UniProtKB/Swiss-Prot annotation:
Its main location: nucleus. Residues 107-184, 226-288 form the BRCT domain. The chain holds residues 1 to 321 of 613 of the full protein. Keywords: Chromosome, DNA damage, DNA repair, Nucleus, Phosphoprotein, Telomere. It comes from Schizosaccharomyces pombe (strain 972 / ATCC 24843) (Fission yeast). It comes from the Eukaryota. The FHA and BRCT domains specifically recognize and bind phosphorylated proteins. Residues 23-86 form the FHA domain. This is DNA repair and telomere maintenance protein nbs1. The lineage of its organism: Eukaryota, Fungi, Dikarya, Ascomycota, Taphrinomycotina. One of its GO terms (cellular component) is nucleus.
Amino acid sequence: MWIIEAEGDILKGKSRILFPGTYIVGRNVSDDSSHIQVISKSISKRHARFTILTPSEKDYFTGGPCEFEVKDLDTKFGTKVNEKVVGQNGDSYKEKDLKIQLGKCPFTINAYWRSMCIQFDNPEMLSQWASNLNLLGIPTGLRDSDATTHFVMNRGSSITVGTMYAFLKKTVIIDDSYLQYLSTVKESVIEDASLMPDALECFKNIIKNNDQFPSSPEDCINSLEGFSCAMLNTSSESHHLLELLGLRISTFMSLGDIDKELISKTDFVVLNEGIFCLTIEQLWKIIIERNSRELISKEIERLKYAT
């Protein structure tokens, strides 16, 4: 999201989040959802138009900003963005920082992109919130990306593989509650950016007293290192997740892909011949427990006597 702040008291010492839409910037304008009062006498009544476009699909992957158009509204001394005079028909930008000088006013409005990308757990939640966050200038998606700052989880029953994986990846996880809170509060955030709903606070509220979450994601990392497992095709994101637990991962496909070679190189089979089988949900529940290694090892040796 685009956030503007300024030196002096020309924006009253409040930072503004500039969501998609259009803003008439000037001295003779009252602050509302489409209007930004800048407090300087040497600035036109209506000086500039700030137009923030919607994110494109690409913006989710690159972490890149929404297009920021600047237009000069027939002022005596012009508008400069990044020491370049804004021409007629306007200038537009996809750089992550902008320094906006408005006429003969030495206090620059500094625009910066605070990166926020919300990946979703699930296509149906993505369908629900797509437009809503598109208009809020937050790039959204299903796939994995290095731009992703937040994860929306589904909540229910057991948590999904995608939630487990995001958790261990050290990503901030989030509800529709957060998304609802963001939308009811949007207007206030335009007028003061410190009033942006703290995502981290919502995340901490999720982990608190939650049986489907361990006490820290850090303590799960390499917790099952030294163990081998074999698993199906099922989820690239489950493969990636069990690697984070330190598991040596073997990949099988059919019933009789379990040879003699597999048995001796594998401690357990990840699912969903008489051997040790586990679903990802059950493995997670073992990881929630304080004695993860021991539990697995005790069931491994116990199975050895059975056979």
